[PDB]
Amino acid sequence: NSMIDKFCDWFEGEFDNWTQAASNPTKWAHIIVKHEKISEYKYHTSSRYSYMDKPYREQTVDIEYVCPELIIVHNPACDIIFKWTGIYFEGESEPDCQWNGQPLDSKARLYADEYHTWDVGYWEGSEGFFHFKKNV
Amino acid sequence: NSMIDKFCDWFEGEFDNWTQAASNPTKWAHIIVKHEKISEYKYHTSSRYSYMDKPYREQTVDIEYVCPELIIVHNPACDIIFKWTGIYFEGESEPDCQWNGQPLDSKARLYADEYHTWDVGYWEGSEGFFHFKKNV
Ligand SMILES: [Mg+2]
Ligand SMILES: [Mg+2]
Known part of the structure; x- marks a missing residue:
């Protein structure tokens, strides 16, 4: 209503997983995810350890709508395709x-105030789902 | 013939500016540019100081053709639009x-065996044109 504008409302901002990290500091790094709006439907995305200024992961994405069901967070490296549940x-x-x-x-x-991510590499594997809560 | 395939032939590979750097080492860093083909019309691009393994500049690009004149090296951060001269x-x-x-x-x-680049930031300015020669 429109779906892409609602997505961008939820997607934009700064997120971090303090509660997750603090609860098991030896398993989960404390990471800050930033989704910074450059233009309409254009974001600069980055992940960084919270004690670092420089992100370890960084790219710019276009937000695309594919009628009726889909939101694509686009980058030539890897599109992420979202469906509304x-x-x-x-x-x-x-x-x-x-x-x-x-x-x-x-x-x-x-979610309206959280962002959960799960990344798995062929060789490097994964830690599981990070639980990022959106900062006020 | 087709223009986009010729572009991709020239674009793909590894380039470095040894002659430029060596000729004035206090002005020009020695940098290696790699354009690695992932898929048809899809490349992973990177620039690194030649004594480093990790690039300082890194992204994935889609190669797009816009009829009749244009080749776009696409990334949501910044499209580079090429014309054949x-x-x-x-x-x-x-x-x-x-x-x-x-x-x-x-x-x-x-060019068929060189790649020249010129990047200028609003605040940081520029050094001028880097002259990268394509490695055998
Ligand atoms: Mg793609
Ligand atoms: Mg664009």
Whole structure:
């Protein structure tokens, strides 16, 4: 209503997983995710350890709408395709998803005030789902 | 013939500016540019100081053809639009070009065995044209 504008409302901002990290500091890094709006439907995305200024992960995305059901967070490296479930946006990487030469599988859940991400590399594997809460 | 396939032939590979750097080492860094083909019309691009393994600049691009005259090296951060001159591909950044929050102006020339680049930041300025020669 429109779906893409609602997505962008939820998607934009700064998120961090303090509660997750603090609750098991030896398992989960404390990471800050920033989705900064450049233009309408254009965001600069980045992830950083909270004690660092420089992100370890960084790119710019276009937000595309594919009628009727889909929101695509687009980058040539890896599109993430979101569907509205009735409660949140559920996202999954396209098949050809790669970071920097490594096949990647990504999942994401976008809520009104949380962003959950799940990234798995062919060789490097994964830690599981990060739970990022959106900052005020 | 087709123009986009010729572009991709010239664009793909590894380039470095040894002669430029060596000739004035206090002015020009020795940098290696790699254009690695992931898929048809899909490349992973990176620039690194030659003594480093990790690039300082890194992204994935889609190669798009816009009939009749244009080749677009696409990334949501900054499209570079190339025209065939009769001798080489001349490239210029789209107006909305940004790296990571800084307005950027980019120019490039793509030859059969060289790649020249020119990047200017709003605040940081520029060094001028880098002269990268394509490695065998
Ligand atoms: Mg793609
Ligand atoms: Mg664009």
